């Protein structure tokens, strides 16, 4: 059971991070565009 | 030990974002403070 909870929260957090990281990829390239 | 290193994952993980979006939030704040 314990392993189950650890596992599930792992998958959720990688979901979260991937979305957040794509978003700021977009934001940083936007910052660079307004730089140029 | 199956716990010990599986559990050893999250703390670096939760440390990753916490450092990560900091500048990413700081920069987009610094996007907002001086652009719009």
């Amino acid at each position: 059971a314990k392993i189950a909870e650890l596992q599930a929260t792992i998958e959720r957090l990688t979901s979260e991070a991937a979305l957040a990281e794509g978003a700021l990829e977009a934001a940083r390239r936007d910052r660079s565009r307004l730089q140029m | 030990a199956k716990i010990a290193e599986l559990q050893a994952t999250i703390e670096r993980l939760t440390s990753e974002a916490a450092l990560a979006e900091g500048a990413l939030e700081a920069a987009r704040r610094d996007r907002s403070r001086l652009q719009m």
Partner: nanobody, 99 residues
């Protein structure tokens, strides 16, 4: 400031998954502030080192977080926000002046 924060769950007490704090300057996108997990790991969002700190008991899952002699610009809605039992969950969020 000179105030206390008290963040609990009505259930799922202390099954301490990853669980987080949030804030948002209005008209914008809400985000990360502070997070504690199965270990109460000592990390938050960079803008904290020395200003926002965790402190927990499972009393009613009423985890706390330390918000003293503040920094103003945070003036916005704050919200602890926890993710439990394979699913995320969201609190109310309260308008808050800090300055």
């Amino acid at each position: 400031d000179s105030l206390r924060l008290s963040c609990a769950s009505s259930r799922s007490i202390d099954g301490i998954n990853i669980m987080r704090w949030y804030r948002q300057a209005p008209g914008k996108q809400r985000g990360m502030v502070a997070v504690v997990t199965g270990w109460g790991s000592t990390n938050y969002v960079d803008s904290v080192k020395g200003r926002f700190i965790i402190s927990r008991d499972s009393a009613k899952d009423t985890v706390y977080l330390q918000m003293n002699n503040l920094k103003p610009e945070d003036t916005a809605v704050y919200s602890c926000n926890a993710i439990y039992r394979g699913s995320e969950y969201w609190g109310q969020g309260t308008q808050v002046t800090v300055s």
